[PDB]
Paper text:
Anti-CRISPR proteins (Acrs) are naturally occurring inhibitors of CRISPR–Cas systems that have been identified in various bacterial and archaeal species. AcrIC9 is the most recently identified member of the AcrIC family that inhibits the type IC CRISPR–Cas system. Analysis and comparison of its structure with structural homologs indicate that AcrIC9 belongs to DNA-mimic Acrs that directly bind to the cascade complex and hinder the target DNA from binding to the cascade.
AcrIC9 was successfully crystalized as a single crystal diffracting at 2.4 Å under synchrotron radiation. The crystal belongs to space group P3112, with three molecules present in the asymmetric unit (ASU). The final structural models contain residues Met5 to Ser76 for molecule A and Met5 to Glu78 for molecules B and C [Fig. 2(a)]. Since the electrostatic surface features of a protein are sometimes correlated with its function, we analyzed them to obtain information about the working mechanism of AcrIC9. The results of this analysis indicate that the surface of AcrIC9 is highly acidic [Fig. 2(d)]. Therefore, this highly acidic surface feature may indicate that AcrIC9 is one of the DNA-mimic Acrs. Moreover, the long α2–α3 connecting loop and C-terminal loop exhibit a relatively high B-factor value (average of 54.3 Å2) compared with the low B factor (average of 40.2 Å2) of the overall structure. This indicates that although a major part of AcrIC9 is rigid in solution, it contains a relatively flexible α2–α3 connecting loop [Fig. 2(f)]. We performed SPR spectroscopy to confirm the interaction between AcrIC9 and the cascade. As shown in Fig. 4(c) and Table S1 of the supporting information, AcrIC9 binds to the cascade complex with a KD value of 4.32 nM.
Numbering used by the authors: 5 to 75
The structure:
């Protein structure tokens, strides 16, 4: 169910997420809600690379309660 996700957009800063794909999709939708250009899209990161994301401070975690309060 849950995975690390890399969320990218042309000419934009990469974002990083941990959680379910339903939650990464809600997150991407909120990121794009007012993006006229260079919209974001997510890709699921294979477990082989997961160490390079675990504990990272730029990874928004959907498994934390209230992570989506700003939505």
């Amino acid at each position: 169910m849950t995975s690390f996700y890399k969320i990218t957009a042309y000419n934009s800063q990469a974002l990083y997420f941990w959680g379910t794909d339903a939650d990464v999709d809600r997150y991407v939708d909120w990121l794009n809600r007012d993006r006229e250009i260079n919209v974001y899209a997510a890709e699921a990161i294979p477990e082989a690379e997961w160490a390079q994301y675990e504990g990272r401070d730029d990874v928004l975690s959907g498994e934390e309660c209230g992570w989506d309060d700003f939505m």
